Design an enzyme around this catalytic site. Sequence first.
Site, short mmCIF file in Angstrom:
data_model
loop_
_atom_site.label_atom_id
_atom_site.label_comp_id
_atom_site.label_asym_id
_atom_site.label_seq_id
_atom_site.Cartn_x
_atom_site.Cartn_y
_atom_site.Cartn_z
N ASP A 181 34.68 39.04 38.73
CA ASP A 181 34.78 39.93 40.00
C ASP A 181 32.88 39.40 40.77
O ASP A 181 32.85 39.59 41.49
CB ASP A 181 34.48 41.07 40.28
N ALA A 182 32.86 38.40 39.91
CA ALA A 182 31.37 37.76 40.18
C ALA A 182 31.89 37.06 41.53
O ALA A 182 30.65 37.62 42.38
CB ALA A 182 30.33 36.77 39.27
#
Lengths: 77, 57
Positions: free
Chosen positions: A59-60
């Site tokens: 999810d970065a």
Amino acid sequence: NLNMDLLYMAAAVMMGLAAIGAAIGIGILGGKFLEGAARQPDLIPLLRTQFFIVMGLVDAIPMIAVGLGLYVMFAVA
Amino acid sequence: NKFINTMSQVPTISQLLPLPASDDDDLKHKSWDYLYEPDPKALLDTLLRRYVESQVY
């Protein structure tokens, strides 16, 4: 005028690609999790911690994308 | 014949096939379930053949 008509389009494309990327990434990652939990019941609490450790990096970038999509849609407007 | 004791022995007849319904109960197999390479049933066949050979010996 034309500006807002294209900016809603821009935010749309960015968050749509973000959605696909994040969702399929965690889909694969979670699939390996469930298969690894299947055979042996012992380490569910262990894999479910490595799962979050990795899911953070999945999810970065998609939340960079979502942050900038929301930014465009509500602040560039 | 069965070597029951140093002092005494007895003749016997026992069924080796089909596999007798020995109790052989455990549930700890959940914790360690074998990864069957190449296949489970192939390994099982070789195991049964070896077991009959072992019992005869």
